[PDB]
Every structure is written in C-alpha cells, then in structure tokens.
C-alpha cells in the first residue's frame, strides 16, 4: 500500500536524523576508549612502525598476542607463517585459534616463531550444553586456542594458575570468540600491553592494540 509505504519512509528518516544528531552531541561508541584500533592488511603492514611506536610510548613489548588467522579454505598459509611475529614480542605469551584443519600446522607455526607450546584452551558451545559440528572423523563440539611462550614469565606481571583451560560461552555472530578470553588474559597478565591480529570490530578492548582490515 502506497500510503503504508509512504508512511514508513518518513518514520525511518527520522531515526537517521536522530542518530546523526546524537552523534553530533557526543554519543559514545560501543568501543572502549582505551582500545587502539588500526586498519590495515598485515601483508601490506610494516610492523616496524608499530614496533617503533610501541617501544616509544611503552619502552616495552607485547605481553600477549592473539590470532584467528583467516585460514584459506583466506590469506596464503605461507603469508601468515611469514608475518614478522618474532619481532613483535620478546618475553611473553601468544594465543592462536586453530580450526581442526589447521591444528597441527598452527603448532608448527608457533614453534617456528620460537614459542614453546604449553597449554591449550578449549571452547565449548552451549545450547542454552552441546555443539553440533560436521567433524571429518569425530563431530566437533569445540575449537581451541593454542598458547605458546617465550622468555621469562617468572616475572611479576604474569600470574601462574590464574585461569582455566576450559571456556563455557555461547556463540555470537560466529566467528566470534568468547568474551571470557579477555578476562582469562587478565588473570595471566594484569594490566599489561596486549596485541591482537586479524581483529574484528566487535572484539576491541581497552589497552589492546588491534589490527584487522575490517576496522
């Protein structure tokens, strides 16, 4: 009905008129203020700039790094392996999410960058308690974060025995990782520099650098 349609359009423009107005007035972003989004493609990215600045404003190097590589089924597998991660951090943990397809390869990847595999986080998907995945040999009801370490964590900053291997949350807009990972990272490192690569807009947090081409 034209009258019905004509009617909706005016109602709709009003929202937009309102939202732009609210923004004018300072309406906040969902994003926390302390987060440091950067938009680039890593292949394109020169990590020197990131290192120079980080050393410059912290005189330090990343406590933690996180990854959800966009595995090809889509960055070349070679490209991710070849990212200059080793330069990025000197004494810290690394997290990386391995789909069951890449699980071994990922392992080889962190070891390549000089990490020692010490722990794996497991993430279950709860119906709200089960996940249906079309597993090649066994159906999958989780994916998992592989954690590697280099250097001294005997340091005060990282706290041992502060987190649980298993995580329990619902899946939102997958691929979107559980919130609680950032909490668990708080246990491990309390208020320390963190990084994240391949990052989407939703997952930005305070004190966290983030690089993705979707930011």
């Amino acid at each position: 009905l034209l009258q019905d349609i004509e009617k909706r359009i005016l109602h709709y423009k009003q929202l937009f008129f309102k939202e732009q107005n609210e923004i004018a007035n300072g309406k906040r972003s969902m994003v926390p203020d302390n987060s440091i989004p950067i938009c680039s493609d890593v292949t394109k990215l020169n990590f020197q700039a990131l290192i120079d600045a980080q050393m410059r404003h912290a005189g330090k190097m990343f406590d933690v790094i996180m990854m959800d590589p966009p595995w090809q089924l889509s960055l070349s597998d070679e490209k991710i392996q070849n990212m200059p991660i080793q330069s990025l951090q000197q004494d810290g943990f690394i997290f990386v999410w391995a789909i069951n397809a890449k699980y071994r390869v990922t392992i080889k990847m962190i070891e390549n960058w000089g990490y020692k595999l010490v722990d794996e986080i497991t993430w279950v998907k709860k119906t709200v308690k089960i996940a249906k995945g079309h597993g090649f040999y066994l159906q999958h009801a989780k994916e998992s974060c592989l954690i590697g370490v280099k250097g001294d964590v005997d340091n005060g900053r990282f706290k041992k025995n502060i987190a649980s291997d298993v995580i329990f949350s619902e899946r939102r807009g997958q691929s979107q990782k559980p919130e609680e990972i950032y909490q668990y990272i708080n246990q491990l490192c309390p208020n320390g520099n963190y990084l994240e690569i391949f990052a989407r807009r939703n997952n930005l947090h305070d004190n966290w650098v983030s690089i993705g081409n979707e930011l």
Binding site: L10, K13, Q14, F16, F17, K18, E19, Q20, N21, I23, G26, K27, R28, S29, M30, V31, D33, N34, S35, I36, P37, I38, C39, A49, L50, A53, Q54, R56, H57, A58, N191, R201, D206, N207, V209, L215
Partner: protein, 129 residues
C-alpha cells in the same frame, strides 16, 4: 604506573587512519557507529554542500560524479540534504541550486519555523502532507 589512555593517543596518531581518531589523538566514535567503509567524512560533507551550490538539490546523478565519484548511496545524499536545509521533506527545494550562504539561512529559517510551530523533532522541521 602506565597511563594507558595517553599511550593510546600517540599510537592512534601515527598508526590509525585519519578518520578513526581526532587530531588530539582521541578516538572518534562517529567512525565506529557507522558501518564499513560507509563513514561520512567532514571533508566530503563540505562536498555535498558544495554540490548543491553548483548543481542543485535532486541533481544527485549530476552532483554525484563531480564531488563523490562512485560515490555515495543516492539516498544518503538526499537524507543529508534534508539535514542541511533543516526540513524533513526536501521536495519543496528540488531542482534549485542553493548557495552555502543560503542553505544556512533556509536551515536557520526552517528550524525557527519548526520550533514556534512546535513541530520540529531532532532539530529537523517536520512537514505536513
């Protein structure tokens, strides 16, 4: 004993795209409420205003090539123009090229009119049909 908030700025200055953060180095929530890639920059706002002065309202196809090359949803323009003139029905002004000096007046005038009429919502005058 680190101020994360300060740390955020200098990084955001040399690292983050111009749209993402303000000159001071604070992060501008405008960019982050809008989607993509769909951000409407101050500078191309000037371009809309400039475009109306040259080609006139409802000249979007002609206006579009000159100031936004692809460049914009035909709707985003008309919606934004409704904002420039301070009305919600832009039909009245169509095909008329309006100077920046005059867009300011029409907006100023239309709003005062809305307010006294008591039919202005969100700083835009609502128009009877």
């Amino acid at each position: 004993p680190l101020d994360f908030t300060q740390y955020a700025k200098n990084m955001r200055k040399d690292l983050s795209n111009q749209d993402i953060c303000l000159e001071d180095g604070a992060l501008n929530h405008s960019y982050f409420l809008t989607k993509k890639g769909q951000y409407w920059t101050p500078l191309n706002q000037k371009a809309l205003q400039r475009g109306i002065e040259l080609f006139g309202v409802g000249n979007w196809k002609e206006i579009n090539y000159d100031e936004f090359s692809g460049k914009a949803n035909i709707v985003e323009l008309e919606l934004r123009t409704c904002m420039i003139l301070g009305i919600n029905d832009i039909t009245e002004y169509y095909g008329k090229k309006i100077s920046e000096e005059e867009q300011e007046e029409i907006k100023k005038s239309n709003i005062a009119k809305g307010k006294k009429e008591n039919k202005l919502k969100d700083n835009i005058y609502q128009k009877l049909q």
